[PDB]
Design an enzyme around this catalytic site. Structure first.
Site, PDB file in Angstrom:
ATOM      1  CB  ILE A   1       2.873  58.995  66.581  1.00 19.78           C
ATOM      2  CG1 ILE A   1       2.599  60.395  67.148  1.00 19.78           C
ATOM      3  CG2 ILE A   1       2.100  57.918  67.350  1.00 19.78           C
ATOM      4  CD1 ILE A   1       1.222  60.901  66.927  1.00 19.78           C
ATOM      5  N   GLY A   2       4.527  56.717  65.274  1.00 22.69           N
ATOM      6  CA  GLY A   2       4.915  55.352  64.951  1.00 22.69           C
ATOM      7  C   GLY A   2       4.787  55.036  63.474  1.00 22.69           C
TER       8      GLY A   2
ATOM      9  CG  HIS B   1       4.292  46.329  56.321  1.00 21.14           C
ATOM     10  ND1 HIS B   1       4.666  45.940  57.587  1.00 21.14           N
ATOM     11  CD2 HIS B   1       4.983  45.535  55.465  1.00 21.14           C
ATOM     12  CE1 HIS B   1       5.543  44.952  57.504  1.00 21.14           C
ATOM     13  NE2 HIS B   1       5.752  44.686  56.228  1.00 21.14           N
ATOM     14  CG  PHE B   2       0.387  52.250  58.105  1.00 22.14           C
ATOM     15  CD1 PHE B   2       0.363  53.651  58.094  1.00 22.14           C
ATOM     16  CD2 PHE B   2       0.867  51.604  59.228  1.00 22.14           C
ATOM     17  CE1 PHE B   2       0.804  54.368  59.177  1.00 22.14           C
ATOM     18  CE2 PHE B   2       1.308  52.313  60.315  1.00 22.14           C
ATOM     19  CZ  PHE B   2       1.285  53.693  60.301  1.00 22.14           C
TER      20      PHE B   2
ATOM     21  CB  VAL C   1       1.076  57.732  62.891  1.00 21.15           C
ATOM     22  CG1 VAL C   1       0.194  58.701  63.646  1.00 21.15           C
ATOM     23  CG2 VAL C   1       0.204  56.627  62.251  1.00 21.15           C
TER      24      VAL C   1
ATOM     25  CG  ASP D   1      -8.477  43.413  63.001  1.00 18.31           C
ATOM     26  OD1 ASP D   1      -7.879  42.323  63.065  1.00 18.31           O
ATOM     27  OD2 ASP D   1      -8.609  43.960  61.873  1.00 18.31           O
TER      28      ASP D   1
ATOM     29  NE  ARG E   1      -3.006  43.356  67.903  1.00 17.61           N
ATOM     30  CZ  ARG E   1      -3.709  42.243  68.063  1.00 17.61           C
ATOM     31  NH1 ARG E   1      -3.680  41.554  69.202  1.00 17.61           N
ATOM     32  NH2 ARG E   1      -4.426  41.792  67.052  1.00 17.61           N
ATOM     33  CG  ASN E   2      -5.953  46.306  67.336  1.00 12.65           C
ATOM     34  OD1 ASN E   2      -4.901  46.885  67.031  1.00 12.65           O
ATOM     35  ND2 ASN E   2      -6.223  45.066  66.968  1.00 12.65           N
TER      36      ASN E   2
ATOM     37  CG  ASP F   1      -6.549  47.676  64.033  1.00  7.67           C
ATOM     38  OD1 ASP F   1      -6.558  46.415  64.146  1.00  7.67           O
ATOM     39  OD2 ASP F   1      -5.922  48.202  63.087  1.00  7.67           O
TER      40      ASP F   1
HETATM   41  C1  LIG Z   1       4.506  50.842  66.152  1.00  6.08           C
HETATM   42  O1  LIG Z   1       3.269  51.506  66.440  1.00  6.08           O
HETATM   43  C2  LIG Z   1       2.005  51.167  65.812  1.00  6.08           C
HETATM   44  O2  LIG Z   1       2.074  50.316  64.919  1.00  6.08           O
HETATM   45  C3  LIG Z   1       0.724  51.910  66.239  1.00  6.08           C
HETATM   46  O3  LIG Z   1      -0.393  51.136  65.852  1.00  6.08           O
HETATM   47  C4  LIG Z   1       0.990  52.384  67.668  1.00  6.08           C
HETATM   48  C5  LIG Z   1       1.628  53.800  67.594  1.00  6.08           C
HETATM   49  O4  LIG Z   1       1.595  54.130  66.231  1.00  6.08           O
HETATM   50  C6  LIG Z   1       0.843  53.150  65.487  1.00  6.08           C
HETATM   51  C7  LIG Z   1       1.544  53.212  64.119  1.00  6.08           C
HETATM   52  N1  LIG Z   1      -0.455  53.910  65.362  1.00  6.08           N
HETATM   53  C8  LIG Z   1      -1.327  53.837  64.338  1.00  6.08           C
HETATM   54  C9  LIG Z   1      -1.455  53.038  63.152  1.00  6.08           C
HETATM   55  C10 LIG Z   1      -2.511  53.252  62.286  1.00  6.08           C
HETATM   56  C11 LIG Z   1      -3.477  54.236  62.528  1.00  6.08           C
HETATM   57  C12 LIG Z   1      -3.410  55.013  63.682  1.00  6.08           C
HETATM   58  C13 LIG Z   1      -2.295  54.796  64.566  1.00  6.08           C
HETATM   59  C14 LIG Z   1      -1.999  55.418  65.764  1.00  6.08           C
HETATM   60  C15 LIG Z   1      -2.651  56.518  66.499  1.00  6.08           C
HETATM   61  C16 LIG Z   1      -2.112  56.986  67.683  1.00  6.08           C
HETATM   62  C17 LIG Z   1      -0.879  56.390  68.238  1.00  6.08           C
HETATM   63  C18 LIG Z   1      -0.113  56.546  69.388  1.00  6.08           C
HETATM   64  C19 LIG Z   1      -0.230  57.429  70.461  1.00  6.08           C
HETATM   65  C20 LIG Z   1       0.730  57.358  71.473  1.00  6.08           C
HETATM   66  C21 LIG Z   1       1.788  56.435  71.409  1.00  6.08           C
HETATM   67  C22 LIG Z   1       1.900  55.564  70.322  1.00  6.08           C
HETATM   68  C23 LIG Z   1       0.928  55.633  69.328  1.00  6.08           C
HETATM   69  N2  LIG Z   1       0.798  54.864  68.170  1.00  6.08           N
HETATM   70  C24 LIG Z   1      -0.314  55.359  67.520  1.00  6.08           C
HETATM   71  C25 LIG Z   1      -0.832  54.855  66.234  1.00  6.08           C
HETATM   72  C26 LIG Z   1      -2.983  58.070  68.167  1.00  6.08           C
HETATM   73  O5  LIG Z   1      -2.756  58.771  69.155  1.00  6.08           O
HETATM   74  N3  LIG Z   1      -3.957  58.182  67.283  1.00  6.08           N
HETATM   75  C27 LIG Z   1      -3.906  57.266  66.146  1.00  6.08           C
END
Ligand SMILES: COC(=O)[C@@]1(O)C[C@H]2O[C@]1(C)n1c3ccccc3c3c4c(c5c6ccccc6n2c5c31)C(=O)NC4
Length: 301
Positions: free
Chosen positions: A35-36, A39-40, A43, A151, A155-156, A169
């Site tokens: 998903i993405g 640094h942490f 996902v 925060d 975006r959060n 977030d």
């Molecule tokens: C580059 O992307 C990011 O940094 C996000 O914050 C943005 C991206 O993944 C990150 C890592 N992210 C996260 C970073 C830290 C915790 C949760 C997420 C996160 C989540 C989701 C999604 C998500 C869903 C659909 C498209 C993109 C999504 N992202 C997340 C989540 C989600 O569906 N549930 C939690």
């Protein structure tokens, strides 16, 4: 290279966290479907069973028992933060050698900022105010727990398949977009999102529910501009300035934004008051006013 033996955890804490733990037979992590990342850690798409589509945040390995303990404690607290406009913690796993997983709901439409920015989406004033109302409801809940977010930003917050907004977030759902922005919880961040921070937060590091209300006002402005960057900052504000009224922002909603940025923190509306006021403004619209980007904000970073 550090070995960690998880049997060193306090048995009372391990018992206390059991209701938050997802056993390995209940969870399939789809490692091929990212998903993405940041640094942490990373996902991944996941499946949780009784099935349910979820997001599995895999953290960097924790090798200190104190840090593991703090993670489990945070899990116990966050599990009870249950509200329809707050991203839920479905559970956690802690595998061999301190490898953590945080299981969160999958949000079909990603983050609210990207959603409203997308040219192929056609939001109305009613829609965007309704998103703001949902965020205010989630924040009213968090404030009732004496929890200060810090925060809050478009975006959060995330949007699910039903277009339900979830404030995100925070807690174990932290680290959103951690390459773009540092957390306002970071005392020494080099990329703090100062354009969302209350004046008293910038000047004297005071973080309260009333500074969250300031951030919420900026979030409302993000919504009504369809995700323009704020102020497309301390010295600027102190000249006697605020964000300008978005072209499609109704006057009563701009009045609300100005209240959120009251120079006296105590005079800002509570999130309860914001839910009330925004619910009323929202109710007057019928979905006939389409919102478009301001030409002078398009492509601005
Ligand atoms: C580059 O992307 C990011 O940094 C996000 O914050 C943005 C991206 O993944 C990150 C890592 N992210 C996260 C970073 C830290 C915790 C949760 C997420 C996160 C989540 C989701 C999604 C998500 C869903 C659909 C498209 C993109 C999504 N992202 C997340 C989540 C989600 O569906 N549930 C939690």
């Amino acid at each position: 290279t550090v070995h960690i033996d998880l049997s060193a955890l306090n048995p009372e804490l391990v018992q206390a966290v059991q209701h938050v733990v997802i056993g390995p037979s209940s969870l399939i992590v789809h490692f091929n479907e990212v998903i993405g990342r940041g640094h942490f850690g990373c996902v991944y798409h996941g499946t949780l069973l009784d099935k349910i589509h979820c997001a599995v945040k895999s953290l960097n390995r924790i090798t200190d028992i104190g840090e593991v303990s703090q993670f489990l404690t945070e899990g116990i607290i966050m599990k009870d933060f249950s509200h329809p406009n707050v991203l839920s913690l479905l559970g956690i796993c802690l595998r061999s050698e301190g490898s953590p997983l945080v299981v969160l709901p999958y949000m079909k439409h990603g983050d609210l900022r990207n959603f409203i920015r997308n040219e192929t989406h056609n939001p109305t004033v009613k829609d965007l105010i309704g998103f703001g109302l949902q965020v205010a409801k989630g924040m009213k809940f968090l404030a009732s727990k004496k929890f200060v977010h810090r925060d809050l930003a478009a975006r959060n917050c995330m949007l699910d398949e039903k277009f339900t907004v979830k404030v995100a977030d925070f807690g174990l759902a932290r680290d959103m977009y951690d390459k773009e922005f540092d957390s306002v919880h970071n005392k020494t961040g080099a990329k703090l999102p100062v354009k969302w921070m209350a004046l008293e937060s910038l000047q004297t590091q005071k973080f309260t529910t009333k500074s969250d209300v300031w951030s919420f006002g900026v979030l409302l402005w993000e919504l009504m501009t369809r995700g323009a960057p704020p102020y497309p900052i301390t010295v600027y504000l102190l000249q006697g300035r605020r964000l300008l009224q978005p072209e499609y922002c109704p006057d009563p909603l701009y009045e609300v934004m100005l209240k959120c940025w009251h120079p006296k923190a105590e005079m800002r509306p509570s999130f309860s008051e914001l839910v009330s006021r925004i619910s009323a403004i929202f109710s007057t619209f019928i979905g006939e006013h389409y919102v478009h980007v301001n030409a002078t904000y398009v492509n601005v970073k």
